[PDB]
Design a protein around this ligand. Structure first.
Ligand SMILES: [Ca+2]
Ligand SMILES: [Ca+2]
Ligand SMILES: [Ca+2]
Lengths: 395, 395, 395
């Protein structure tokens, strides 16, 4: 029953056969100290060529072997404040950081590793390796793990790798298409036969129940478009596009930085609590931003970019939310809504209601279905500002 | 997916109420040493008047008693090489041969009994009777059995029979209509709702699955028309029309004999292996038969009668098949296809596809049904050449 | 300059994007003593489920493990008369026969293994295994090999396989699409500038050279359609459809058998020497087959099926050829010719001639290109009669 801004702002394109294909270019250079990954929503995997940045694997350029080694790592997720390794415990895993920041405290907090960093190199070769620093995850993120035993097995598999390891001991174009499959929001509406036979003259309680069902389906559509793992702007956004606040509250400097990272930003999406926090920051700074009109409707904006409320963005127990800056379009590579119309029996252009059966208890069943998905044409189309403290007040 | 010659050659007539009636005349004369039977597909029963050929029942002409005695016999089937009775074992059954040939070897192979023969007469009267010959079934067939105890019970039932038996101890017209009931080929097609909602623009996978279902139904129709027991040309063919090969391979003399037994033969039906064997025999004899055109299609023929391949004719493990010679028509008494059109919801003139229900798992069910049967107006419309050796090669 | 029957008889269909897709159903049942394979032209691979017919692998039904084991076998080809294994040599390989016949002579010729047979079971488990029979390949064919070491490695990889092996020691539907890529026949025509400037009034020697080039390209097209390994009727034909002659000369019984295996055969393709041998056999048998008219052209035929000469079918040094029986069509699943028209610069509907450059020596270069391929919709569309002795004369 709430306002659905993402549904009415994202353009909808018609897929054929319930599938879509997006061609991805992944530019990456070796030697720069950062490992680049391939991300498919929430599932991530290291680029096989990038894997060569590791010294113990430098100058090895057999595509088969690198691909196998890349395939044998395991993805793990860590929450804020969770301890991953502890000082004193023997080291047996190589950790490649894909997202988040992790502060390492030695026996003296050395520094904080971030996206593209590695720790655990020496643990791979010798069995005497011991963790001398404690890594505490300051921010939630992902991390790839390469076990010593698996790499040893791969070494015992390829003779070329043995010889290269024994000898050492003494812009790249990568095309890989991404396939999007239409997800379904489905439900069963059970209407008693009496309610369909009698209550049908001045208003249809069947039609009113169907409208309520459609509204619930649309709310689920928005919640999935925001929070789903395979597709979904919160999770299926490039790791480089996700920024951290300088101080924690959503100061206007953070909004300027969020607008810096991409061209032609269309709008901001944030929780209403987050919008209140941004307004508090604006009042503290003493500036009054203008409001712009979209569709004959006035809306708060920053630098002319409208800020739209979305209640489906989660609020963490620590009262920290996130802000999304995103451009929409097909001619300009942005975010599109994949949706198939022309269904066999449409109550609405995107909907399909079909009579299922009548039970022995005289209850008619209807199947209400809609098919939807989201596509991001280029990586630099959605930026996310994370860990935004929304419970800060002037003191 | 194979060619269906029987479906496209048999004329189809429309039955009313799903039933058909065929009037049968069964001419039979007494005293000629052969017992005539009434055959309804695979179920056979002795004519009550013919039962009088037995000496111990000669001159008894009470219709009630003869009908009762005829009703109290049991039909049994025997395969090739199976031993039915053994020398030394006491005789307690009267056996009337309805089909097949059985060679009797005494203590010296006496002869071979055939259709209409009887053995076990004396076993009926006295209890001292003992089998002095071993009957080995050279060919598969049927056989009626009259037990001594049942006949004794019938004797103890009718006073007239007692007096006639005590005294002895010191062209007929029979009309009996045959009723044909339409059989059904039915199936359930389960199509997922997603496959019906999305995959429907450039080609319908629902329609393609329906076409595959229809093809499977047609294949089952042919297999039943050939091999079914109630109706079906292989089994519902007159015992006099079934011939045995003189040598075992399908020599052209056998085809001439098969064409001799009936007037206006329409075509031959045989397995493709059988057609290859016939071609081998033709090449061995040195004659090259002509080919005739039906429906603008050239086809091998013998004496101008086309020979059509049918893969539904079974091949026995001994590599022996059968050939069918049959005439089709309604104005000329032959073989007709009973089929009812004008169904409530027809995808095809003979078909009926109806939506059944949608399951809780969002699977749509369709019921695909067709109604069919076969009728043989006169006994001399289908002839069968049996035990045709199809694995014979020149040496 | 010769007659090109295959070019003018095969229907040509237009592919989109230079690629075609054929959906294959591979029905196979386990326990019947024959292993079924998947064939892609000349490359063959064992079905993973069929691999379970081996006792030492019976009841193991892990799809991953079976797929891995199937992937780790090696395909080998053997010619007629070549010895593969010898008596006395230690056994270290499991051999699965995919095509051809191999006679095994023990210390006494035991028998002849054929397609779907296996020999070398016990060699897999123990290292004491020794070949006690000599296998001589009577006919050319293929053979899959499974080494003992590879299977042992797979066992050491999967814990489930170890447990199943330790315990033992104490119709299936498989869909897999086939992709056809258009092959190219290309050439460069070098015409001197003087020949293009002067010899152009009454006849164009440039155009005459182009016609000769086109004829050579068409001859190469036919030779590839017949003899190519990836596609090509001689090699890309089902192993079950390939038959062996009963005696060696192409007797009419062999032609009858070749017509038996498939429905609606369109024509025969054979070398003119093979056609002469068939005519000699016909004269010896004393039968004179009729001739039929296609396209207003009379042609020899057998059972009404025209026999077309093709000089591109190889003749072996032993003077043995092969005969092809094949049906053509798209509505009836047969053999189609994949070809793309509408090229950017067409001299002919299927051709493309493009000016390349003019050399410093004043020689104009032209690029003449054509794109073609062959598709076989169903396995039972091409049958091959092999090892046909064509040098047999009456004596
Ligand atoms: Ca790099
Ligand atoms: Ca009689
Ligand atoms: Ca099998």
């Amino acid at each position: 029953i709430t306002s659905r801004w993402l549904l009415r702002m994202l353009p909808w394109v018609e897929t054929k056969g319930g599938a879509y294909r997006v061609n991805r270019r992944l530019t990456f250079t070796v030697g720069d100290g950062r490992v680049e990954f391939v991300q498919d929503g929430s599932t991530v995997r290291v680029i096989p060529q990038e894997l060569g940045e590791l010294a113990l694997l430098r100058d090895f350029d057999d595509a088969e072997v690198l691909s196998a080694i890349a395939d044998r790592c395991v993805q793990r997720d860590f929450r804020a404040g969770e301890t991953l390794v502890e000082r004193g415990t023997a080291a047996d895993e190589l950790h490649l950081i894909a997202h988040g920041r992790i502060g390492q405290a030695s026996a003296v907090t050395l520094d904080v590793l971030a996206d593209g960093d590695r720790f655990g190199e020496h643990a791979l070769l010798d069995e005497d390796a011991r963790w001398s620093q404690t890594a505490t995850a300051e921010t939630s993120g992902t991390l790839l793990t390469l076990s010593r035993a698996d790499f040893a097995a791969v070494v015992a598999n390829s003779p070329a790798l043995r010889s290269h390891l024994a000898a050492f001991t003494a812009a790249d174009y990568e095309l890989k298409p991404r396939e999007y499959e239409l997800s379904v929001a489905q439900t069963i509406l059970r209407v008693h036969t009496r309610v369909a036979d009698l209550y049908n003259g001045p208003m249809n309680q069947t039609e009113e129940q169907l409208r309520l069902t459609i509204e619930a389906l649309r709310e689920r559509q928005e919640h999935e478009l925001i929070n789903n793992r395979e597709f979904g702007l919160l999770h299926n956004a490039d790791f480089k596009q996700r920024i951290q606040t300088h101080s924690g509250p959503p100061t206007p400097d953070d909004l300027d930085e969020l607008l810096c990272r991409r061209r032609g930003t269309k709008f901001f999406l944030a929780h209403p609590r987050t919008i209140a926090a941004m307004g508090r920051e604006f009042n503290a700074r003493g500036l009054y931003p203008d409001h712009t009109d979209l569709g004959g409707q006035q809306v708060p904006a920053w630098r002319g970019v409208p800020i739209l409320p979305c209640g489906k963005i989660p609020i963490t127990p620590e009262r920290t939310s996130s802000i999304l800056a995103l451009r929409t379009g097909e001619e300009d590579q942005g975010v599109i809504g994949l949706r198939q119309t022309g269904l066999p029996d449409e109550y609405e252009p995107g909907l399909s209601v079909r009579f299922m059966n009548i039970d022995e208890k005289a209850i008619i069943s209807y199947l209400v279905s809609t098919y939807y998905s989201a596509a991001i044409l280029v990586p630099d189309a959605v930026g996310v500002l994370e860990n935004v403290q929304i419970a800060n007040w002037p003191r």
